[PDB]
Structure formats: C-alpha cells, structure tokens
Design a protein around this nucleic acid. Sequence first.
RNA 1: AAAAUUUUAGGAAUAGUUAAUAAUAAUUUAUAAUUUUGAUUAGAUUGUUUUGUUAAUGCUAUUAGAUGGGUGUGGAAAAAUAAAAAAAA
Lengths: 212, 203, 108, 50, 86, 170, 162, 124, 89, 226, 413
Amino acid sequence: ASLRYRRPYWMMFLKGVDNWKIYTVIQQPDHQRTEMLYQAWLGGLDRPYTRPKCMANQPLWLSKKRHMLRKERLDGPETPLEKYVLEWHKKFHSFQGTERPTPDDLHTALDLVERPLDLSYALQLLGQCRNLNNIRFAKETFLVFLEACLRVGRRDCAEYALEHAEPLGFWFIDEDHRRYLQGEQTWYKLSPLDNLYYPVEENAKLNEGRKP
Amino acid sequence: ADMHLQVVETMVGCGTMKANDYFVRNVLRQFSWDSRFLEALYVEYRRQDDVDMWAELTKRALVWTARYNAPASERLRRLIEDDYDTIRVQTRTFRELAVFQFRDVEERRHSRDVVNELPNPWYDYVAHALPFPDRDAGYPDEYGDLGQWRAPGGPGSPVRGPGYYAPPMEGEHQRGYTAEWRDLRNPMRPPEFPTPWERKYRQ
Amino acid sequence: AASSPVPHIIGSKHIDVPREHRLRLLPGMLYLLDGDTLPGEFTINRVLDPTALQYYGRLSSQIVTVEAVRMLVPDDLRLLCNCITFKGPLHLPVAPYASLASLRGASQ
Amino acid sequence: IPQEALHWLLRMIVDNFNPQHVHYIAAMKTLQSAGELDMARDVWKIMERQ
Amino acid sequence: ARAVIKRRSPQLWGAPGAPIIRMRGHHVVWKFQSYDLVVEHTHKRRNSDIRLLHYLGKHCPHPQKSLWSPDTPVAQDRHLFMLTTV
Amino acid sequence: HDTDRHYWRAVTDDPRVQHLIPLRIRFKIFTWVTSGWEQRMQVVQIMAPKDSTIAQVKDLVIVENQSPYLCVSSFHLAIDGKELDPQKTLGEYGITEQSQIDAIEQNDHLLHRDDERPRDWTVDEITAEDVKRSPYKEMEMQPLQNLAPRYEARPKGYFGRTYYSGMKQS
Amino acid sequence: PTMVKFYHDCLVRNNRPREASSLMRLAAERGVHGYEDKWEADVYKGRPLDSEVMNESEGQASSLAFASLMLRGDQRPLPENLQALLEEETTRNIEAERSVPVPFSAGLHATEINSVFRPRVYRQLWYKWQHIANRYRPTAALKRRQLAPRDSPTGIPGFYRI
Amino acid sequence: DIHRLRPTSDFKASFKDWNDLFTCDKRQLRVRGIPRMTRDAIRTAVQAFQNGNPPERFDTKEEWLYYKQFKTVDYSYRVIPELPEKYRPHQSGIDQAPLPDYREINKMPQWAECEERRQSKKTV
Amino acid sequence: RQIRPYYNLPSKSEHGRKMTGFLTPYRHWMWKQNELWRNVHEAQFEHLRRVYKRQWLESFRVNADEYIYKYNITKAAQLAQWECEMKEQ
Amino acid sequence: RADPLNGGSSMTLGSKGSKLSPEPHRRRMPWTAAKEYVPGVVLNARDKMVLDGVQLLDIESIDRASQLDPLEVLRAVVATREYNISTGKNIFQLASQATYNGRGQRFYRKEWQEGTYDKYVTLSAIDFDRDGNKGTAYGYITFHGETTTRPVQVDFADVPGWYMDFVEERAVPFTGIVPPPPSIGTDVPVDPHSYRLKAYPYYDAPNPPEFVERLLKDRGVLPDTP
Amino acid sequence: PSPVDECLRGGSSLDKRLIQEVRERFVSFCREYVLMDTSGMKSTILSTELNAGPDYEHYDRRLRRKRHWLAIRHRFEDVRYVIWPDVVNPSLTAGEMLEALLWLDAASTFCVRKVHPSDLGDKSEFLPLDLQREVEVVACHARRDLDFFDPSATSLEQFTACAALCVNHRVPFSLFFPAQDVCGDASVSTGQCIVANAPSPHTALGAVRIMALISEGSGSDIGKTIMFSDAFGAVTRFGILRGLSRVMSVEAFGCKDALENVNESELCIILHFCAEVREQNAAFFRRYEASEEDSDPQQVSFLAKYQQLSQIALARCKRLLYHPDSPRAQVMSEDGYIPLVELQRHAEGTNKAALIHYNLGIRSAQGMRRVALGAQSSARLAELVSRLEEASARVSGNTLVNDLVHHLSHKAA
RNA sequence: AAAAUUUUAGGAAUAGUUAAUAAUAAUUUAUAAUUUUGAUUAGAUUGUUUUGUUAAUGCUAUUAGAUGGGUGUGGAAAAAUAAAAAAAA
Ligand SMILES: [Mg+2]
C-alpha cells in the first residue's frame, strides 16, 4: 500500500500537502501558467516565478519571505503590553525558529498589565509556555501571576489556579498565597521596603503605623 | 586469544578464583574469544560458596555469549546440562527440544519396528546423476526421411544430412555421410561403437 | 598508553613543523602534553554544547576526568585541533613501563 | 561439504576439460584442510588415471 | 513493484523468484484434465521459449482400473490405480 | 577486471622471477624486567633483490616490519659500527645472508613515511587492496571464503521425460 | 485558434503568466473557437507594466524601489535596509533553481518535448484556406487493415512515417 | 462474515442446526442454493474450526469501503486523490487575496468593555 | 497471510485501516506454539534436503568414475587409430 | 545472510519469517532496518473530547476582537494540558519538569519492564526545539544489566507512553557529563542479591496456566461450553 | 549572414553604442562558433561534391562549420579596426576588448584545417589568424589604465590569458604593464615579466598554468628566467626568488590532496618546473638543503615550499603509477558542477536518506576521468624523476624510474 | 556479444554517415562506409522440419514473442490491467 510507484520519487514520505496530484502535471503548459499566476496571487515576488520541479511545498527561502512580509493581525498597539506581544511573535514565533522563551520573559509580559484586555494577551502567552514551548516555570512565577491579576481586579481567575496548579505549571505556590485566595488569610505578602500588608484595603486594618 | 586462554585455564586449574576478573579485564571486551574460555570459567564458577553466585555467574556468561557474538559450544552446554538439578539453568532453546523429542521418539520407534527396516530404492540412493545416459538407446538418427527438406536441421536438431541423396561432399564429410554417421533405420546392424567396444559385440 | 610504552604519544612540546608544511604533515598526528598550553595561530572555540560533550562520558568516568574540550580553527580554516584537558589521576592502573608513567599529571 | 572439492574436479573431466596441476593441488590441499585424506588419495588416483 | 499490480496473481520478492516445484494443469475440461509436476520460477515466464526449468513428470488425477490383477494377486490389488511418473 | 591476461598460461616466465637475498636486520630494543630496562635485539627479515641499494633495503625494512614500535624514527643501517652509504649496492659491500646489519635509531626525530607503493608490487601490476601481508609470508593456495559455489541451473537441451537426442547441437 | 494555441505556449515557455492570462482572457471575449470556456481573472489588475517599472527605477522614494514587489494586501514591506537585503536573497535563490538542469529533458522545455510539426499535406490531406499552420493528423485516424485487407496494398505510402 | 462478497450471515436459514452445518460438503452447499464464494468461505470456516482454528478474524468491510472511494486501479489500499480542473482560487473567479478589515478586528470585545466599566466603577 | 483477529489493537483512524497488527500476549504464546509445531516439520525437511544432496553427489562420484575409466580406454584406442591413419597418409 | 530464522529452511515462506534479515533488504532503503517499533496510531491520536466546551485560539490571531475572557483562557490552557497528557507522558514532557532536564534519570516504556523484558535508558542529553513536546533525546541503553558504551538516539522519543521515577542521586548537572551506568557483568562485580537476571539466553518463560486453558479451549481439547 | 553585416551597412561608426553593439555581436558570433555542437558534423573528402558544394541534406554536417569559419575571417577583416583601432577617450574598455580578442583567439585556434577540392577560395584561409596588432592595442589600453590585474581568481585567469596572448602572438608582455616598472632595464623577456608580476594562485591548476607559461614563454631563455643564485650558492636576484615562492603558494600546494585534480599531462609540467628550478640553481640547493642553516626568512620559505611541491608531485606520480584507474586516482574539474548536490538542495527531503536521481547523479560530475599513465606520460616522468635527483645519485637504485620502465615494458608487451 | 537464412510483373543510388584516436562528453586525421553477388526508401509483413496434401528434399498454412519521452523508481520498465503462479501464522 505504498505510493513508491504511483508518484515521483521526490514525493517519498510526502504528507500534508493540499493535493499531490497537482505537482505531477505542473510541467504541462496550461498548469505551468496556473502555477505562475498562483505565485503572483500569493505575492512577495517581483518577477514571474515557478516552484522547482522536485518540490511540492513552497521552498524554504520563499515561505520565509512570505512569513516576514505578512502583516500582523494586531495593528496600532496602544498599550506597551501589546507592543510586547508583537515582540513576542517576531522573536518566539518566527518561521522555523529554534530559540525557546524564558520564564523571565514571561515575567516581563506579566508586569505590563494595565487593562483587563492585557490579561487575555498575557495568559495566552502563559499557555504557549506550558503547552507549546513546554517550559518549567520559575519559583516566583505564581507571585508575578497573582499580582498581575490584581491590577485588573480579577480575583476569580487567580483562585482558579489554586484548585489545579499542576496543569497550569505552578510547581511552587507558598502557603500565604493559598490562605489569601481561599479566605483563610486576608493578605498575601508583606512589603520589605514599606512594612505593610498588600493589598492596601487590608493595610488600613492591619498595620496602623508606617515602618521602614 | 589462545595466549590468554592458557592463562585463564591456569588460573582456573590452580583454584585461585580470579580467572573471571582476568577474563573481564583483558579478554572480554577487546578480543574475539571463543566459547571454550567459559569451559574453563564454569569450573571457576562451580567452586563458589553459594549456589546463587554460581547461577548468576553462569547466566551472566550466557549473556556474554549473546552480546559479544561468541556462540556457546556443545561442550559448554553439556557442562551446564549436568548440573540442571542444582542450578536449573536452561541451556537449550525452545525449538531444539521440540525437534529433539519428536525426532528421538520416531527414531527409536523406527529402530524397534521390524517392518520398516527394509531398504527403499526411492529413498536410499540416487541411481544416476550424469547428464548423459550410460548406454546407447539407438537415438539419434542423423539422417532425414520422407517429406523432410531441412537436413541438417541446424539449431537443436541432430540431423546432419539428407536422408537419401545429397550434393557432392569432400573430405571427412564424404566419409561421414556414406559410412560413419548414425543410422538407426539399419535392420541388420546397429550404429557401431568406438574401438575396442565393437570387437566383443560382433555376434 | 597506560599499559604499554607507545613511542611518540607523549612529547615535551608541540611539534614544530614549518608553516608551509603545516597542513601536509599534521592531520592524523596525535600527541599528549603536560598542562593546558595551546598552539599559536589558532582560534579557540570551547565546546560547551551538552549534546557534544556527552560522548566523553565513558572517557571521563572510567578514565581521567575531562575538564575542557576545545576546537582550534586556524586563520586559513583548514586544520582543526581537538584539545581535551584531562585532570589526573587515572582510574586505570598504570604500568611503570607504560608511556603515561613518563607524565607528571598522570602519575601524580 | 568437502566432498564437493572432489565433485568439481570430476565434473571438470565429464565436461571434457583437462585438469591442470593447480586443480589437483587445490583439491588435495582443500581435502587435507578438512581432514579427508582418502578423498585426497582419490584425487591422486584421478590424476594418475588421466 | 509495478504501478498497477496484477490483481489476480500476486507473488513475493519479485521476478523471477526462487525455483518451485508445481503441479500445472491444462486448459481442458476436467474429464481429460491431467497435471504436470514441473520445476519453474515463482513468476511464470511467459516471454521465453523456455517456460520451465525441469519437467519432473505427469500425474493423472483420474483413477484407472487395475489391468494387472491376475498377474500376481497381492493384498489390495483390485482397487483403482493412480498413475504418476516421478 | 582487466588484469592484462586473457588466456591460460600454467607456467611462470622470466619477468616475474626475482633473485632475492634473505637479509635479516637487527634493532636495539628495550624490554621491562623486574629490575628495569634491559637491552635486547629484535630481528626483521626481508627479501631484498641482489641489485638493490641500501636505501632500498631501508625502505624494504620500513614497508615490511608491520610493527608499530620498531620503525618509529629515522634510523641508519650499519655493519660493525661503520655506517653504510645508502647510494651503494649490496655487492659493493659484499653483504651476504650471514652479514650482521644493525639499525641505529635517532629517537628525537619522527619518521614521516608515505606508503604509496603496495606491499606486493611486481612487474605484472596485480596487487590486492586488502593484502595485509608481504607476499613472501602468505601461503600459495588457501580456501576461498569470499566466493560462493554455484551449480548449473539452466539446462541446454534436455528438459524432461525422454532423452531422445538431448539437443546436443543446440 | 491555431495562433492562440502557439502563442499561449510561447509565453508560458518564456515565463510570462501576465501575457498568457491576458491572451486567454482575450480569446474568450472575442469568441475564438475552443477558448470560450478558458477565462482567467486578472491578478495583475493593480500592478503596473514591467517596462514602466524599469525606467522609473532609473530615475515616493521608498515606493520607488519596491514598486515591482507584489503584495497580497494583507502584507506590508520591511524597512528599506531590511527589504533590500531580502530582495537580493530572492534573486540569488531564483537563479540557483533555474541553473540546475532537469536530467531527462535534453535541455528542452516541456513545451518542446514531443512537438514534431509537419503541415497538413503530410497525412492524406490537401490545401484548405482556413488551416494556416495545420499539424498533421495522428496515425490513429487511418488504421491499416480497415482500408485494405490482409496481403493487399493500401494507398497510403507516407502516412505512418513521422 | 468478514467479506462483502461473501455474505455468510445471509444463509442462517439454510441449515437446521450445528451438525447439519458441520456435516455438509460443498456439493450439498451447492444444491442448497449458495453462491460459489459464499459456500467456499463456509466450507473453509468449517474446516478451520475442525482443525482447531475458531473464526477469529477482523471484519474488513468498512476499511475496504473507505479505500473504495479513491481511484486505485488494483484496490491496493493506497490513497489516490482526484484532481479537478480548477485547483487554484484565481481561476475560480476570485481576483486577489482577501484583505482583512484591520479596524473591525482591532475593536475591543464586549467582555472587555464590561470589565473596563467595572474597573471604572470600582476604582473611584 | 498474516491473520488479523478481532482482539488485536484497534486503530481508531478514519484515514486508514481500522485494525493494527499489535497482538495480545496470548496470541504471542499460541503463535510460538504453532511456530514450534512447524519447526519440527521444517527440521525434517532440511534433514532430507541435505541427505538428498549428499546422495546425488555420491552417485555423481561413482558414475563419473566409471565414465572416466571407459572414456580413457576409448580415447586411447581412438588416438592409436588416428596415429596409424596419419602414418598411412 | 547474517541472521536467518532457523537457518535456511524453505518448506514454506512463513518458515523464513516476516522479515528475512535484521539488515535492510535493499541498500537504497535504510528505513527498512529491523527495529522495535511503537503503536503510534493509538498513542499520537489524543482524545479530542476533552476540548469540548473549550474555545481554543490560533497563534496568529492576536487581534483584539478574537480575545477571550481570562477565566476562559485559563480553562483553555488546562484543557490543552489535559489533552496533551490524555494518552501518555512524553520524554520531553517528563524531562522538562525535572531537575537538570532529567539528565541521568532512567526513562522506560510501559512494556519494557513486564514479562521477562528488562530495559531502560539512562538519559544523557536532550535538545529541545521550539515546540517543547518534540526534539531529540540521547541516553545509554541498559538491557538486562548490560549497557552501551556510547549514548544512542532514543527512538520514538516524541511518542507518548514513557515513564520515569526521579532519584536525586542520579541527577547530573549541566557542568558535568552524565556517566554511563555500569555493566553488571563487566564493570561492577556480579551480585545475586543486588541484581538477579529475569531472563538469559536459551531461556524461555514457563507456560501460564490461563494461556494453556485458553489454547486448549480454542483447539477443542477442553470442553468449552456456555 | 551574420548580424554584424547589418551593423556595417553604412551607419555612423563613430557612435559609441554602435561600436559596443558591433563588439558584442562579434563576441556572440565567435562564442557560438567555439561552443558549436560538433557531434554529427563530419568533414571527409567526397568525390561527388567536386563541381558543387555539399548536398542539401548534408549542409549542417559538412558545410556549416566551414562557412562559419570563413564568415569569421571575412568579418575579422572588416571589424578589427573598429573594436581595436590603431594606437595614435576610447569607446571600449580594455576588458571587453580583451574578451573579444580572447574569443577571437579561441575561434582561431579551432579553425577548419581540412581543405577540400570543392573549395574555390585559397587554402591559406584555412590557417589560424595572426592577432599581433590586436594584442599590442589591448596591451596599450591595459597599460593605460591602472589596476587591470587584481589578486582575484578571475583576474588570475585574465593574467594567464594575457600572458598566453603575448606568448602565442610574439608580443612582449612588458607592454601590458606600465613602463616605470620596466624602466631601468635594457631588455626583459615574457617569462621574466610573468615571474615578476604573477599573483598568488588559490588553486593548483592556476599554478600549473603559470608554471607552463614560464617554461613556454622562454624556450632557450629558460636559464635566464629562473636563475636567482650564483655559482657558489649565494642568492643573486631576490625578485625571482619572491616570484617563485609565491608561485608555489600554500593556498595551492598546502594540502596533502592538493594534486587530486592533476592529470598525467599537468604532472609532467609540475615535474619539469621542479627539475628546471633544481637544475638552474643546483649550487644553491645542494648547499642549503643538506646541512645548512640560513638567516634569510625568504629562503627557508622557498625551500619549504619547494620540498612540499616536490614531495606532493612524487606522491601524485606514485598515485597514478601504483593505482591505475583507481577511485582515489580519479580527477575532477576545479569548481566542478556535481549536479547531485544541486538536485538534493532544490528538492524537498522528507527522508534525507532517500536521494533523488541517485543512479544518475552518482555517476556524473563535471569532467571526471579515471587516470592512468600512458606511454608518453611514463617515458617523460621517468626522465623527470631522475632529473629531480643529483648527478652523483645512482639512477639504477631509484625504485620509481625502474617501476616506470617496467610499467612501460609491461603495458607495451 | 558473433555466424546464418525474407518477398516484390515493368530494378538505382544511400547516409546525424566508416575507420583511427592521449577523444567518458571526438573543435583533429583519412584516397572513409552501403550497393548491380541487388542497397536505402515505398508496398506486403511477428517469425516457427509443429498445418494440409502427395509416391515425392514438391506445393501450401501458422496466433511463441517483443515494443528509446507515464514515474530514473527498481536488481531488471515488462507498470494503468490477466480464472491462481496461493502472495512472508
Ligand atoms: Mg589524427
């Protein structure tokens, strides 16, 4: 049940093309015009071009150009977080990329959240680090993730990470972060530079004095 | 390897219990050793204190025969065969035993049977293996007959000349076509043998 | 080298061939020296890839511990030199008649 | 089997070839290397009967 | 190893394969059908004048009456006979 | 397979016949005993032609020692301490089979050789690639393990039932 | 209709898809027989001609060098120092793919393979005005043994000879 | 019943019991009104069960029905797709590549507007 | 033909075949039993092969020896007759 | 050949086996070399029924109108992780959650430890690509105590179904080199209390009584009845 | 009819682009003559074509190349004062005039030589052209502009071609260089100007071409070309030493496989060059190579380069002798087109072990031959290897001249 | 790879051509090669002591086959369809 003798030998082990019956009759002149008009339909070429005879997919130099020439779906970034998403896709989503992201790079995306739309862009970068890039998080990753969701006032997603953290990738969650979101404690951190309990609505009850 | 074999056999025969370490360090990974090394070393395996050390050393020797492409000889397998009540190490495959039982029972039943001990000419021998028969069956004819125009037949035909009349020949063809070729249609005399096999068949 | 005396495996210095005969005579030649001194007219490229350093695992465990693996590429880019730095002593027993008994880093 | 070393000499004579001295030397050395000495003497008798 | 495989007679390891002893038949009716024990290739050579390697004999699958019963009566001599040359 | 011989010649003619002398040449080696190093002698035997020079004898020692410990540096041939001129023939020194020849090495150098000539090179230009041994050491006839015995599988004229003629004309 | 069959094959041989798509679009509108079904959309509708690009490049400066570059509409150009390094990347990759020969072509395009031409007089036909360059009819038009029986001569001396 | 052209399960009414199924030869299968491939499959299954092989085989009907829908000439379990006359979008009437409306897709969604309103209420 | 039983590993795949060739350990064990029962027959087969080979070689040896003796006598008489005819010519 | 089944025996074509030699039968197809393969149809096809009621998003769709609620994004991440784990555990999914990328630890397939089969792979190096579920893994193969001398490529390293048990003593940092585990015959001395061989050459496992009962009921020897 | 016939039909020849058009049309004419596919074309004297030309069916096989060469001659008589005008700002540069002269010389060396009785013209038109004035005009236009010769490889091939044009057409090579580099000298030869202005070659083949032009540029003056030493061993002229050291450069002869593409004919040129360098400077070599240490950093570099070149030349001779037609004795073209690599690059490899066009690509590369020593090669190499030694050495005990003589006798028998 | 053997009621010229060759992949040399002892082309055209007849070395018949551009895959293109040649339990 092999296609060794039904198609040319350069289509050996070939899967995932649109239709491999196209590339056996390309050299016919009515199909040769159709291939060159399709390369003009795809853009990126200043001269008439046909793909090589022993290639079914586009060449590696040509698909690299069309991926770089393709305009991003997000035009006119307003927030500096949305500029960081465009820097994330130029660096960690380039054509045939090799370098993986860093847990410190995820902390930079989680530190630029201003509006609740930014949390949808930031948490989808957190999903690419766990599922797509498969990166083990740092020890303080849940700390930056918790204070990111409190800037936008979204607590119901922060407690959503506590009921199942090992699918999300938070291998270290300290107990004072667990007691805050579950309702045992009413603060989640102590400031080393200000000596007050965060958030500031609880600091008016707990610490009535300001200490260095 | 034959230089290390005498050293291994000397350390086995002296009972020093260090021939296996010498075989591991010097002969195992860096030599094309035959199986008879272990035929010494199993005796060094035999003199161990506990039976489980003997068993594990024998099984490790079998894994060494598997890994380094040195197959176990018949003498080593018969050495491990004699201590099967103590070690219980299987030294024959699952295929050879099923062949051996069905062969040995059949050969014993065939040797005890008095009917099937008779010789069978279809089974015992080959009567003739040469490409040509040993005596003349009369054929070929080397002549034509009535209605045959093609003589000699050329490719794959033993006819050499026409049956009755021919164009004039010279030399050895003149002696051949008239006297010396085969003729099985002769009612008096068969086609004659070469000398001296014609004098004793004159009558 | 730890079990029999090999003749030219250990020298006192790098072999001084002329610069014109450098590409012709040097490839295929091996020698051991004492200390980490590298030849001149070479660019030092240290092998830090764990995919490339894993093949010295048996060399670093059962024999001398591999400290550094360096690739030396010259100015004309035509003569490599694979420099491996070992740290003594050997885990193998060294014969007194062997070549590595004439080495200070191997005997100490 | 080593008997083929005696066989390919005999088929050399059935096919009307004259076996040279190298064929007899190779047959006797091949049959002596396998421990068949009577077959080597039969090769010698074949050489004498030719 | 063809593009469109011969669907009715597939074989193994290409042509011409190992020599095989077969019992080939004729394109006749069953009442005159006989078999030839032959040695041929795995794929039948249809482009040659040599279509077989060696002819071992002929087997007749129809039983014949024993025409040699009064010669010397032995046990089970009057049964039918299956003639074959080997 | 062009071996410059397209017929059968069972004899050996004059261009392959060489007149050889079995010259044995000594090397000063050192062996390890329980005390220390002891100086001994290692002999390398070659078949040198009678018309050869001493440089050719040195090259024959280099190509036929097949030992990684003997020809390691630049050595010099000598007889009774007196060194030999490598541009002189063996007949000019009267060197025979009983002549004791020594090889004095200079171990500070390093012998860089180029073995571009095969070990079995005669005038007929027939050399093996997997030769691995001088032709004086190898046996004349041995069993061939690389080939395979093949029988006749194509019958010529006889194929079957009755041998009438056998198609011996074919 | 014979002229459009030749001229379409010449433009696809000389790497002209714009001139070939405009020829099939023209023959479908004029009612040429055999081309009323072949009508292609004009993908070069917004693009200028290739000749007017070249004299514009000798003489908006960011759009001057990249006027020949074709974009889908959902594509944007790079910076001009980055795009010009990418434009010479493609022109060295096109010439690398066009220099390697196809091994069983005898140095010919696929239009020229099996393209033997003789006029209509070579196969049992005579002059007609509407057949300007008429390729000779195939040998399957007249079979032997349907015009004359076996061992009988047929009046076609040079038919099957190409 | 594993084959499409061997409908073995269509002849359950052609036998009375187990012994009648296992004692009938091919001539008795022929006179009962069974086609040739079906009675050959029945006799082969009976002779395989007599030799110790129960009918444990995979039903190859749906797999062959999947492989039938392609244009393999020899039914050799390959996949050969059909190529239509128009396989590119430019020749099917579509002029150029569709451009996305970048002002429509870059508007803030309704949940984002509701959360911005909630943030503006809770911050003040 | 390789048998595909119903209790093999099913390939839940709509783009190919519905049953793989991955067995059960019971199927592995019974296949080993059938392998041994074939191994007995093929052992006897190879034994009779080698026996018939050496039988054919021994028969060729004996018949070739007899043919060589008779053919040497025949060729000696033929060469003597040819020498006499050459002398007369 | 190099390794035929039962020597040369050709009474049937099944007597040769399903493959005539462990080497590739043609020189032009090196992928036809005989090796242990893995049922990738059942393993690579993960259960898509855990993604129902879950709105996944494309990578390229970074426009503002296509974004989802952060609770919906988090449940999409949880559903995608449970989709990737749903069949089995990968090598690259087990080693990323380990110290020093799991270097020195022992990875094993499920069927590598049952029956009389004993084989594992001591990991030495893993080079992750951008899609962190794939890549290439290297390790020393240990089969019944004997170990390779060099690290070999772990075949089917991306197909799920792998297992490991983390041991802190086996963890090798990125500064050092992963040492090869010792051969129990050669390197360390043989001890029956430490490691005992489950199988050896010329050894076959005894017949289980349930398989004997099943085969004798299938062949008709035992009276199987409803 | 050539296209140049429509360019000389009465136009204004002083126009610059018309001169450029005439030049490129003549270049294309000479190049299509040189690269003409001459597979089926045969020129045998046929009696039936006496009072006519060749027949209409054999025009392309008999008449085409002769008419092409006669058209080249009749256009060269009309064009050679337009492309290369006489020496009294120019319309054509020196490079394009050099390219036109090179294709004209390539058409002149491969002229039609066989004169049939059918030919009505003179037989002297079937002889090669004399291009001396054109070489002098190109040399004047090349010494007019600076940096005409560069250290690039294409300029190395241009240097080789210009030295070839000066050797063949009796023109001094000193006209190609400015006169201040030749001033202070009464007379210089072609070979001395080659050895004084040679660039350092990056391949062995360019050095072989330079070493061939050195020997052929001075036949009887080969002594005065490469003598840089006195009769006592002291170096006389260091310019020839610096030229000969940068001829046998390390980028050309440095690797052990540097002579892997050297045929049997080029190895004779290498050994003849080494033998001439040893013979002209014997008092230098027999003093310095044995037991002499020198303080000059140039002399040790020259000695190391000469020893390396002699050793790799003898190794290549032993390669071609002891392994005839071996796969390690095969040659190939420099920058040779191996189409299997370009076929693997411009294809999609899903399995990289499956190489497409393997049965054809593994057989075919740009010119690749099995090399063995012929009669004319072995008889010359047996002389040159004996020339490499000294006069006091015994030629009987040399084990390479004896092997070459026995190879000659064995292959002749 | 070689030898060898076809026919035309109104009988004449033929050629990607012959040999040499340091020449794969022919820039050269030659007084080149086939043919009136019947060539090339055109017509007819698988051949085959297997058929039929007769006193007939006469006359008369034939159905084994092969297939330089469909895919450089495969050991070999013979590959777009064949009641078996049973095709790896
Ligand atoms: Mg000539």
